[PDB]
Design a protein around this nucleic acid. Sequence first.
DNA 1: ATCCTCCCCTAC
DNA 2: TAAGGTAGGGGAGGAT
Length: 428
Amino acid sequence: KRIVACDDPDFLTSYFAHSRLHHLSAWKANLKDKFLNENIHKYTKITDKDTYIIFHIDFDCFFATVAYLCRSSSFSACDFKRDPIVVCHGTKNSDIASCNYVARSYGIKNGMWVSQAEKMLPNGIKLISLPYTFEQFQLKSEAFYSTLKRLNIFNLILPISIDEAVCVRIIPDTLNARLCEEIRQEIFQGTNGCTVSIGCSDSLVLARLALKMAKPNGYNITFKSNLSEEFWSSFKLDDLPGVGHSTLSRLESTFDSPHSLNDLRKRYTLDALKASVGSKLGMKIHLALQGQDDEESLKILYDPKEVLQRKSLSIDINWGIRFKNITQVDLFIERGCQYLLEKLNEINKTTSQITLKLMRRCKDAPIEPPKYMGMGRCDSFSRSSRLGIPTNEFGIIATEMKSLYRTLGCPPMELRGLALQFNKLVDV
DNA sequence: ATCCTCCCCTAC
DNA sequence: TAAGGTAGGGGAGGAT
Ligand SMILES: Nc1ccn([C@H]2C[C@H](O)[C@@H](COP(=O)(O)OP(=O)(O)OP(=O)(O)O)O2)c(=O)n1
Ligand SMILES: [Mg+2]
Ligand SMILES: [Mg+2]
């Protein structure tokens, strides 16, 4: 019991063992690598000449499904179909990593705090909190990916995350529904009780939207030609890939608060969209609302090996950071370089460029944030440097990192988060 | 134009 | 209390 503090040599070990976000990142990097290792001698890229169907396949409320299947006996009482269930560490300002669809019927969402969620429950409804079972998440994910491989359906299986894969069938010069059904069935068995939904389309963007539409335990087909207003009407603006909270808020401020993708598509003009959200992103949204992928998104089909090749490496710690003096900070920075250099040597790379980035308490923010041990409201400060030669040397790297911290000049007592980055990685 | 640094955003 | 990580697209503004 009793959490290891940031000035302890084993902070990172203990914090990473508990952070579900760190697992998500680690599992993602490992799946990319596993992809590169398995396809060393496989000719891999899709062409413009190629005709293809995307099957975007994703576990439903993963984590809540798997924590529930693996639950301890003191929750046998529990019932996935009727009870609101979440997976989380605590009881107040503690993130809900995953909630089941009964929880979502009350308005509860994945990154919400437990205290916020319990306000949403009417009288006589009790939130059930399950613990994380990281090993088990990983076992179901393995069963998933081996099951996909074993059916011999796809020309290519792109790992996007621990519970999600984009699968491509190449069609030379009805079936699709049976294939959806087989995949959902075989994954449900190979996994034991877990459910997957499937979006199937001729675009990556439509497949992702079809997936959302399918989503409690179903599949949904939807091609560029099946687009209708009743389809677009069913999606929030941030159901678009690449649109999240800031873009939502900009889209709303520009197009008088459109409430569904349908309302947006009827109101927007390419020009105003670009001026609003960026251009690129605006361009992406534009193409999306016609069912089409932007060029950036497509690189993953036209060259998976490149897109999936890791181009940088870092840690980023924004919880539990509390220091009194620079000695503690320097030692921490040194430990973080030690950790990172073990990773760098494991992937047989060196670095030519480094960044130290930090979160500093805003002038106006309480010294102790509402979230226990949290970073609270902060400003970002970042500085990078080019190394003369690519190296994996501790002395070069740790010294420049401690040097970069002095240049940003954050008093230790104000530090609330810190990131150490190797931008630019050089082979061999 | 283009490139570089310091961010912001999104994903999951 | 509680574990707010991390890769990588992208833009603004200065430097060339
Ligand atoms: N803010 C978030 C979002 C997700 N994850 C974790 C837990 C989720 O179970 C898993 C996969 O994330 P998804 O976005 O796919 O969401 P779910 O699988 O939970 O729900 P859905 O049925 O909407 O796919 O990643 C998390 O910890 N915090
Ligand atoms: Mg999911
Ligand atoms: Mg997912």
